[PDB]
Amino acid sequence: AITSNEIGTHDGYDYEFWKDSGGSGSMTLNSGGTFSAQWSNVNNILFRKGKKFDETQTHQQIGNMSINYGATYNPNGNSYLTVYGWTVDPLVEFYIVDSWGTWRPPGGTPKGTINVDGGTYQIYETTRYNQPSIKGTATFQQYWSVRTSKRTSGTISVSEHFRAWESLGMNMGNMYEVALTVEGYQSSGSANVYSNTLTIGATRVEAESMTKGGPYTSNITSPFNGVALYANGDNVSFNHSFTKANSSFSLRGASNNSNMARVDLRIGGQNRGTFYFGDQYPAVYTINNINHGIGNQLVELIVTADDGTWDAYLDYLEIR
Ligand SMILES: [Ca+2]
Ligand SMILES: [Ca+2]
């Protein structure tokens, strides 16, 4: 295990153990973006796995960034579970915080909010005066998106936070780092980051992000994150701008049991086909060659053949 400061690359990912004086820590690196960590009686500690960059590109130039993660997170004291990193020129230290210990960061008055990844994050900006940094002691801005309640797994749409910050005038520099991170302050604890995939660079719409309609539509977590349509008239819908007139649609779903489940597709109020799922194991059903014509159009997925013998579970819809 790593028990003192160290920077390196492990299985494709840039890792770092960093602490100041006082107490101890231990970090074990596992496959891909994963790692586990332990600390006690620290002042400041950071464990992370992500990507470090060469400081010549903006986040736009590098491309879309998304982290998909899960962690077991048991801090004892002040701690964060967060995406963390830096820009340079200008020097900015930044956090997208999904969970924490005893204290929810960072103090001060929010500049804004963003609703993303199924949660709500309040946005903050502070100046740090004469503080340690990747470039030595310096004065720099610190930007934060902090979830309004705790979560320890899911998807963090890093680029979307970056754009929200910029839209509020929180200017960003060239990237130095983006990493899923475990931080402790004046604390002890442990964490097991069992899943951490950083993805850099067809539209997929998650069922659980669409508008719900009908009497019973509800979110589900098994056999995937998505929604259940239980009765006639249960639906989910969203608006989409079609740029061509002809598309393929792929729905990933399942029945709740071994009876076949069916979900009708409509575009601008008109019936365009049905998706079939023959049992409880997730699968993708694809409707090809749908002529619908151009512009903003309401996409709906709705149950119309329910008879009290099955429900339809929907994970996501892909449009090509
Ligand atoms: Ca039903
Ligand atoms: Ca889903």
mmCIF file of N, CA and C in Angstrom, residues 207-306:
data_model
loop_
_atom_site.group_PDB
_atom_site.id
_atom_site.type_symbol
_atom_site.label_atom_id
_atom_site.label_comp_id
_atom_site.label_asym_id
_atom_site.label_seq_id
_atom_site.Cartn_x
_atom_site.Cartn_y
_atom_site.Cartn_z
ATOM 1 N N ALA A 207 -34.317 6.763 -19.176
ATOM 2 C CA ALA A 207 -35.733 6.802 -18.843
ATOM 3 C C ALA A 207 -36.010 7.604 -17.608
ATOM 4 N N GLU A 208 -35.093 7.467 -16.655
ATOM 5 C CA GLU A 208 -35.302 8.032 -15.325
ATOM 6 C C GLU A 208 -35.077 9.590 -15.361
ATOM 7 N N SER A 209 -34.611 10.136 -16.467
ATOM 8 C CA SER A 209 -34.510 11.568 -16.640
ATOM 9 C C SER A 209 -35.705 12.215 -17.436
ATOM 10 N N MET A 210 -36.708 11.402 -17.874
ATOM 11 C CA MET A 210 -37.774 11.891 -18.732
ATOM 12 C C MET A 210 -38.856 12.382 -17.831
ATOM 13 N N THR A 211 -39.846 13.034 -18.424
ATOM 14 C CA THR A 211 -41.049 13.427 -17.666
ATOM 15 C C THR A 211 -42.007 12.232 -17.473
ATOM 16 N N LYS A 212 -42.397 11.925 -16.258
ATOM 17 C CA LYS A 212 -43.339 10.928 -15.942
ATOM 18 C C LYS A 212 -44.819 11.339 -16.143
ATOM 19 N N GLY A 213 -45.667 10.388 -16.561
ATOM 20 C CA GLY A 213 -47.085 10.669 -16.803
ATOM 21 C C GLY A 213 -47.833 9.423 -16.450
ATOM 22 N N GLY A 214 -49.094 9.613 -16.115
ATOM 23 C CA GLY A 214 -49.993 8.531 -15.893
ATOM 24 C C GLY A 214 -50.109 8.289 -14.445
ATOM 25 N N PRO A 215 -50.889 7.307 -14.054
ATOM 26 C CA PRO A 215 -51.199 7.083 -12.660
ATOM 27 C C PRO A 215 -50.110 6.513 -11.774
ATOM 28 N N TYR A 216 -49.147 5.726 -12.274
ATOM 29 C CA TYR A 216 -48.269 5.019 -11.364
ATOM 30 C C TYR A 216 -46.793 5.028 -11.707
ATOM 31 N N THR A 217 -46.408 5.636 -12.803
ATOM 32 C CA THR A 217 -45.085 5.609 -13.258
ATOM 33 C C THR A 217 -44.168 5.911 -12.079
ATOM 34 N N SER A 218 -43.116 5.107 -11.941
ATOM 35 C CA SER A 218 -42.155 5.310 -10.872
ATOM 36 C C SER A 218 -40.745 4.849 -11.206
ATOM 37 N N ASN A 219 -39.801 5.401 -10.467
ATOM 38 C CA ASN A 219 -38.412 5.123 -10.612
ATOM 39 C C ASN A 219 -38.151 3.776 -10.085
ATOM 40 N N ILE A 220 -37.162 3.111 -10.677
ATOM 41 C CA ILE A 220 -36.735 1.821 -10.144
ATOM 42 C C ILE A 220 -35.207 1.769 -10.217
ATOM 43 N N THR A 221 -34.653 0.844 -9.455
ATOM 44 C CA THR A 221 -33.210 0.561 -9.391
ATOM 45 C C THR A 221 -32.802 -0.843 -9.820
ATOM 46 N N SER A 222 -33.747 -1.773 -9.955
ATOM 47 C CA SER A 222 -33.503 -3.123 -10.475
ATOM 48 C C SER A 222 -34.559 -3.432 -11.545
ATOM 49 N N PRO A 223 -34.191 -4.074 -12.656
ATOM 50 C CA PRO A 223 -32.857 -4.620 -12.922
ATOM 51 C C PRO A 223 -31.826 -3.652 -13.440
ATOM 52 N N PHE A 224 -32.249 -2.405 -13.528
ATOM 53 C CA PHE A 224 -31.371 -1.268 -13.833
ATOM 54 C C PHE A 224 -31.983 -0.015 -13.235
ATOM 55 N N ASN A 225 -31.237 1.087 -13.290
ATOM 56 C CA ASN A 225 -31.793 2.368 -12.983
ATOM 57 C C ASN A 225 -32.676 2.808 -14.133
ATOM 58 N N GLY A 226 -33.926 3.056 -13.800
ATOM 59 C CA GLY A 226 -34.865 3.460 -14.893
ATOM 60 C C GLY A 226 -36.251 3.743 -14.353
ATOM 61 N N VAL A 227 -37.292 3.437 -15.141
ATOM 62 C CA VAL A 227 -38.672 3.579 -14.626
ATOM 63 C C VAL A 227 -39.513 2.323 -14.901
ATOM 64 N N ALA A 228 -40.565 2.118 -14.131
ATOM 65 C CA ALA A 228 -41.573 1.088 -14.350
ATOM 66 C C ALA A 228 -42.869 1.808 -14.850
ATOM 67 N N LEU A 229 -43.515 1.242 -15.893
ATOM 68 C CA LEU A 229 -44.826 1.636 -16.392
ATOM 69 C C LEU A 229 -45.701 0.493 -16.075
ATOM 70 N N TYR A 230 -46.629 0.672 -15.151
ATOM 71 C CA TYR A 230 -47.411 -0.377 -14.601
ATOM 72 C C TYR A 230 -48.757 -0.548 -15.264
ATOM 73 N N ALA A 231 -49.387 0.576 -15.622
ATOM 74 C CA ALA A 231 -50.783 0.535 -16.078
ATOM 75 C C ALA A 231 -50.975 1.274 -17.400
ATOM 76 N N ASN A 232 -52.110 1.001 -18.054
ATOM 77 C CA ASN A 232 -52.436 1.799 -19.249
ATOM 78 C C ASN A 232 -52.399 3.275 -18.943
ATOM 79 N N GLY A 233 -51.695 4.009 -19.801
ATOM 80 C CA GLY A 233 -51.487 5.417 -19.668
ATOM 81 C C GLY A 233 -50.206 5.816 -18.926
ATOM 82 N N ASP A 234 -49.596 4.897 -18.146
ATOM 83 C CA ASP A 234 -48.220 5.196 -17.687
ATOM 84 C C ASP A 234 -47.323 5.489 -18.826
ATOM 85 N N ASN A 235 -46.538 6.558 -18.728
ATOM 86 C CA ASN A 235 -45.620 6.923 -19.769
ATOM 87 C C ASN A 235 -44.452 7.748 -19.285
ATOM 88 N N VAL A 236 -43.443 7.830 -20.133
ATOM 89 C CA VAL A 236 -42.452 8.843 -19.992
ATOM 90 C C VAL A 236 -42.323 9.524 -21.323
ATOM 91 N N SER A 237 -41.952 10.813 -21.334
ATOM 92 C CA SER A 237 -41.841 11.591 -22.585
ATOM 93 C C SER A 237 -40.740 12.631 -22.406
ATOM 94 N N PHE A 238 -40.258 13.143 -23.516
ATOM 95 C CA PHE A 238 -39.373 14.267 -23.498
ATOM 96 C C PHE A 238 -39.476 14.870 -24.905
ATOM 97 N N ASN A 239 -39.034 16.127 -25.072
ATOM 98 C CA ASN A 239 -38.922 16.782 -26.395
ATOM 99 C C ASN A 239 -37.544 16.572 -26.959
ATOM 100 N N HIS A 240 -37.467 16.355 -28.258
ATOM 101 C CA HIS A 240 -36.203 16.137 -28.938
ATOM 102 C C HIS A 240 -36.287 16.842 -30.287
ATOM 103 N N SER A 241 -35.204 17.534 -30.671
ATOM 104 C CA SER A 241 -35.056 18.132 -32.010
ATOM 105 C C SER A 241 -34.439 17.150 -32.938
ATOM 106 N N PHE A 242 -35.267 16.727 -33.855
ATOM 107 C CA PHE A 242 -34.845 15.879 -34.936
ATOM 108 C C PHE A 242 -34.315 16.817 -36.036
ATOM 109 N N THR A 243 -33.166 16.455 -36.586
ATOM 110 C CA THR A 243 -32.552 17.193 -37.670
ATOM 111 C C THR A 243 -32.748 16.456 -39.013
ATOM 112 N N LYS A 244 -32.831 15.120 -39.011
ATOM 113 C CA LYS A 244 -33.301 14.381 -40.202
ATOM 114 C C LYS A 244 -34.720 13.850 -39.961
ATOM 115 N N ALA A 245 -35.365 13.353 -41.018
ATOM 116 C CA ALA A 245 -36.768 12.910 -40.949
ATOM 117 C C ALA A 245 -36.917 11.425 -40.667
ATOM 118 N N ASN A 246 -35.815 10.684 -40.757
ATOM 119 C CA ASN A 246 -35.839 9.248 -40.594
ATOM 120 C C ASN A 246 -34.851 8.721 -39.526
ATOM 121 N N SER A 247 -35.364 7.967 -38.531
ATOM 122 C CA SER A 247 -34.539 7.450 -37.392
ATOM 123 C C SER A 247 -34.777 5.969 -37.021
ATOM 124 N N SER A 248 -33.817 5.438 -36.286
ATOM 125 C CA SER A 248 -33.856 4.153 -35.613
ATOM 126 C C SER A 248 -33.974 4.468 -34.130
ATOM 127 N N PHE A 249 -34.783 3.708 -33.399
ATOM 128 C CA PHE A 249 -34.928 3.859 -31.944
ATOM 129 C C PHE A 249 -34.668 2.536 -31.299
ATOM 130 N N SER A 250 -33.867 2.560 -30.252
ATOM 131 C CA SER A 250 -33.478 1.372 -29.525
ATOM 132 C C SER A 250 -33.860 1.577 -28.074
ATOM 133 N N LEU A 251 -34.754 0.742 -27.582
ATOM 134 C CA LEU A 251 -35.143 0.831 -26.166
ATOM 135 C C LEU A 251 -34.546 -0.312 -25.385
ATOM 136 N N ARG A 252 -33.855 -0.015 -24.309
ATOM 137 C CA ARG A 252 -33.428 -1.089 -23.390
ATOM 138 C C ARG A 252 -34.386 -1.168 -22.241
ATOM 139 N N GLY A 253 -34.956 -2.334 -22.089
ATOM 140 C CA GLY A 253 -35.986 -2.603 -21.105
ATOM 141 C C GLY A 253 -36.162 -4.068 -20.773
ATOM 142 N N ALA A 254 -37.255 -4.402 -20.111
ATOM 143 C CA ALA A 254 -37.568 -5.724 -19.722
ATOM 144 C C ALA A 254 -38.960 -5.753 -19.245
ATOM 145 N N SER A 255 -39.528 -6.954 -19.194
ATOM 146 C CA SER A 255 -40.713 -7.231 -18.405
ATOM 147 C C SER A 255 -40.310 -7.396 -16.953
ATOM 148 N N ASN A 256 -41.278 -7.280 -16.075
ATOM 149 C CA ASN A 256 -41.107 -7.661 -14.687
ATOM 150 C C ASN A 256 -41.124 -9.169 -14.447
ATOM 151 N N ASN A 257 -41.592 -9.929 -15.424
ATOM 152 C CA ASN A 257 -41.646 -11.354 -15.279
ATOM 153 C C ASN A 257 -41.507 -12.037 -16.629
ATOM 154 N N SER A 258 -41.997 -13.252 -16.713
ATOM 155 C CA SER A 258 -41.789 -13.988 -17.945
ATOM 156 C C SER A 258 -42.834 -13.754 -18.994
ATOM 157 N N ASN A 259 -43.821 -12.895 -18.741
ATOM 158 C CA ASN A 259 -44.828 -12.537 -19.739
ATOM 159 C C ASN A 259 -44.291 -11.433 -20.583
ATOM 160 N N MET A 260 -44.624 -11.439 -21.850
ATOM 161 C CA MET A 260 -44.123 -10.391 -22.720
ATOM 162 C C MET A 260 -44.648 -8.990 -22.394
ATOM 163 N N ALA A 261 -43.754 -7.981 -22.365
ATOM 164 C CA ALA A 261 -44.231 -6.632 -22.062
ATOM 165 C C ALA A 261 -44.118 -5.796 -23.332
ATOM 166 N N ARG A 262 -44.998 -4.829 -23.503
ATOM 167 C CA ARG A 262 -45.002 -3.966 -24.679
ATOM 168 C C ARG A 262 -45.102 -2.501 -24.339
ATOM 169 N N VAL A 263 -44.368 -1.672 -25.042
ATOM 170 C CA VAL A 263 -44.306 -0.242 -24.798
ATOM 171 C C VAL A 263 -44.483 0.422 -26.176
ATOM 172 N N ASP A 264 -45.500 1.265 -26.341
ATOM 173 C CA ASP A 264 -45.742 1.976 -27.604
ATOM 174 C C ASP A 264 -44.914 3.223 -27.684
ATOM 175 N N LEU A 265 -44.495 3.501 -28.884
ATOM 176 C CA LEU A 265 -43.746 4.672 -29.177
ATOM 177 C C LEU A 265 -44.645 5.651 -29.936
ATOM 178 N N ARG A 266 -44.582 6.902 -29.548
ATOM 179 C CA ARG A 266 -45.229 7.991 -30.263
ATOM 180 C C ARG A 266 -44.276 9.139 -30.438
ATOM 181 N N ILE A 267 -44.417 9.788 -31.583
ATOM 182 C CA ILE A 267 -43.719 11.010 -31.867
ATOM 183 C C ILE A 267 -44.744 12.056 -32.415
ATOM 184 N N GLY A 268 -44.713 13.253 -31.839
ATOM 185 C CA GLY A 268 -45.750 14.270 -32.018
ATOM 186 C C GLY A 268 -47.196 13.757 -31.917
ATOM 187 N N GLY A 269 -47.487 12.879 -30.961
ATOM 188 C CA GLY A 269 -48.839 12.423 -30.699
ATOM 189 C C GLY A 269 -49.266 11.240 -31.520
ATOM 190 N N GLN A 270 -48.517 10.981 -32.599
ATOM 191 C CA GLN A 270 -48.754 9.878 -33.500
ATOM 192 C C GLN A 270 -48.017 8.525 -33.161
ATOM 193 N N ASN A 271 -48.742 7.422 -33.265
ATOM 194 C CA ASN A 271 -48.263 6.098 -33.074
ATOM 195 C C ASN A 271 -47.255 5.769 -34.116
ATOM 196 N N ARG A 272 -46.089 5.259 -33.690
ATOM 197 C CA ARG A 272 -45.024 4.876 -34.611
ATOM 198 C C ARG A 272 -44.475 3.493 -34.419
ATOM 199 N N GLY A 273 -45.052 2.677 -33.565
ATOM 200 C CA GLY A 273 -44.462 1.372 -33.325
ATOM 201 C C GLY A 273 -44.540 0.936 -31.886
ATOM 202 N N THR A 274 -44.137 -0.301 -31.669
ATOM 203 C CA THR A 274 -44.143 -0.928 -30.380
ATOM 204 C C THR A 274 -42.792 -1.648 -30.131
ATOM 205 N N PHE A 275 -42.311 -1.567 -28.892
ATOM 206 C CA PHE A 275 -41.105 -2.250 -28.424
ATOM 207 C C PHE A 275 -41.583 -3.469 -27.663
ATOM 208 N N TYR A 276 -40.956 -4.650 -27.849
ATOM 209 C CA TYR A 276 -41.373 -5.868 -27.140
ATOM 210 C C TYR A 276 -40.205 -6.377 -26.273
ATOM 211 N N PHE A 277 -40.514 -6.846 -25.073
ATOM 212 C CA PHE A 277 -39.553 -7.443 -24.168
ATOM 213 C C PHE A 277 -40.155 -8.739 -23.701
ATOM 214 N N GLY A 278 -39.491 -9.816 -24.050
ATOM 215 C CA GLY A 278 -40.031 -11.167 -23.849
ATOM 216 C C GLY A 278 -39.846 -11.775 -22.472
ATOM 217 N N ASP A 279 -38.949 -11.207 -21.636
ATOM 218 C CA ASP A 279 -38.897 -11.682 -20.261
ATOM 219 C C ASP A 279 -38.180 -10.625 -19.402
ATOM 220 N N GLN A 280 -37.837 -11.036 -18.201
ATOM 221 C CA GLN A 280 -37.306 -10.170 -17.161
ATOM 222 C C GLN A 280 -35.859 -9.770 -17.243
ATOM 223 N N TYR A 281 -35.157 -10.275 -18.246
ATOM 224 C CA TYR A 281 -33.762 -9.996 -18.461
ATOM 225 C C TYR A 281 -33.623 -8.855 -19.470
ATOM 226 N N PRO A 282 -32.883 -7.815 -19.089
ATOM 227 C CA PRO A 282 -32.725 -6.657 -19.933
ATOM 228 C C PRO A 282 -32.277 -6.947 -21.287
ATOM 229 N N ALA A 283 -32.855 -6.255 -22.252
ATOM 230 C CA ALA A 283 -32.536 -6.417 -23.654
ATOM 231 C C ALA A 283 -32.833 -5.173 -24.375
ATOM 232 N N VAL A 284 -32.307 -5.067 -25.559
ATOM 233 C CA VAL A 284 -32.564 -3.921 -26.419
ATOM 234 C C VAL A 284 -33.451 -4.303 -27.566
ATOM 235 N N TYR A 285 -34.558 -3.605 -27.716
ATOM 236 C CA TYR A 285 -35.443 -3.763 -28.851
ATOM 237 C C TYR A 285 -35.382 -2.492 -29.696
ATOM 238 N N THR A 286 -35.204 -2.718 -30.985
ATOM 239 C CA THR A 286 -34.907 -1.672 -31.978
ATOM 240 C C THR A 286 -35.970 -1.584 -33.062
ATOM 241 N N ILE A 287 -36.511 -0.390 -33.237
ATOM 242 C CA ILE A 287 -37.483 -0.057 -34.277
ATOM 243 C C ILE A 287 -36.715 0.780 -35.311
ATOM 244 N N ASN A 288 -36.686 0.290 -36.526
ATOM 245 C CA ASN A 288 -35.904 0.916 -37.595
ATOM 246 C C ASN A 288 -36.829 1.691 -38.525
ATOM 247 N N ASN A 289 -36.284 2.712 -39.181
ATOM 248 C CA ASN A 289 -36.925 3.352 -40.348
ATOM 249 C C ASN A 289 -38.207 4.060 -40.011
ATOM 250 N N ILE A 290 -38.166 4.903 -39.005
ATOM 251 C CA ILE A 290 -39.335 5.608 -38.589
ATOM 252 C C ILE A 290 -39.254 7.003 -39.212
ATOM 253 N N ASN A 291 -40.251 7.311 -40.046
ATOM 254 C CA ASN A 291 -40.411 8.605 -40.685
ATOM 255 C C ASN A 291 -41.267 9.438 -39.722
ATOM 256 N N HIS A 292 -40.722 10.557 -39.266
ATOM 257 C CA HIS A 292 -41.381 11.418 -38.291
ATOM 258 C C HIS A 292 -41.309 12.921 -38.623
ATOM 259 N N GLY A 293 -40.436 13.297 -39.547
ATOM 260 C CA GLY A 293 -40.220 14.720 -39.820
ATOM 261 C C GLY A 293 -39.643 15.601 -38.682
ATOM 262 N N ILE A 294 -39.220 16.801 -39.117
ATOM 263 C CA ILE A 294 -38.107 17.544 -38.529
ATOM 264 C C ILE A 294 -38.588 18.499 -37.409
ATOM 265 N N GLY A 295 -37.638 18.992 -36.614
ATOM 266 C CA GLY A 295 -37.898 19.965 -35.568
ATOM 267 C C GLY A 295 -38.223 19.362 -34.233
ATOM 268 N N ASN A 296 -38.330 20.206 -33.217
ATOM 269 C CA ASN A 296 -38.811 19.815 -31.904
ATOM 270 C C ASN A 296 -40.110 18.945 -31.979
ATOM 271 N N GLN A 297 -40.064 17.750 -31.372
ATOM 272 C CA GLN A 297 -41.174 16.812 -31.379
ATOM 273 C C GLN A 297 -41.244 16.087 -30.015
ATOM 274 N N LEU A 298 -42.456 15.854 -29.495
ATOM 275 C CA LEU A 298 -42.642 15.171 -28.192
ATOM 276 C C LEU A 298 -42.393 13.665 -28.468
ATOM 277 N N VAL A 299 -41.466 13.041 -27.732
ATOM 278 C CA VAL A 299 -41.244 11.579 -27.792
ATOM 279 C C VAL A 299 -41.902 10.995 -26.570
ATOM 280 N N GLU A 300 -42.765 10.011 -26.784
ATOM 281 C CA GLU A 300 -43.406 9.325 -25.690
ATOM 282 C C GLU A 300 -43.201 7.809 -25.788
ATOM 283 N N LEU A 301 -43.169 7.196 -24.614
ATOM 284 C CA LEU A 301 -43.123 5.760 -24.438
ATOM 285 C C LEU A 301 -44.239 5.467 -23.494
ATOM 286 N N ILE A 302 -45.237 4.696 -23.919
ATOM 287 C CA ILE A 302 -46.442 4.557 -23.119
ATOM 288 C C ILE A 302 -46.982 3.188 -23.200
ATOM 289 N N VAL A 303 -47.506 2.688 -22.089
ATOM 290 C CA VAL A 303 -48.184 1.429 -22.061
ATOM 291 C C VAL A 303 -49.652 1.560 -22.437
ATOM 292 N N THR A 304 -50.099 0.742 -23.393
ATOM 293 C CA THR A 304 -51.502 0.642 -23.809
ATOM 294 C C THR A 304 -52.074 -0.778 -23.848
ATOM 295 N N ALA A 305 -51.264 -1.814 -23.595
ATOM 296 C CA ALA A 305 -51.776 -3.171 -23.596
ATOM 297 C C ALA A 305 -51.704 -3.870 -22.246
ATOM 298 N N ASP A 306 -51.528 -3.159 -21.147
ATOM 299 C CA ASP A 306 -51.530 -3.814 -19.865
ATOM 300 C C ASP A 306 -52.841 -4.527 -19.532
#
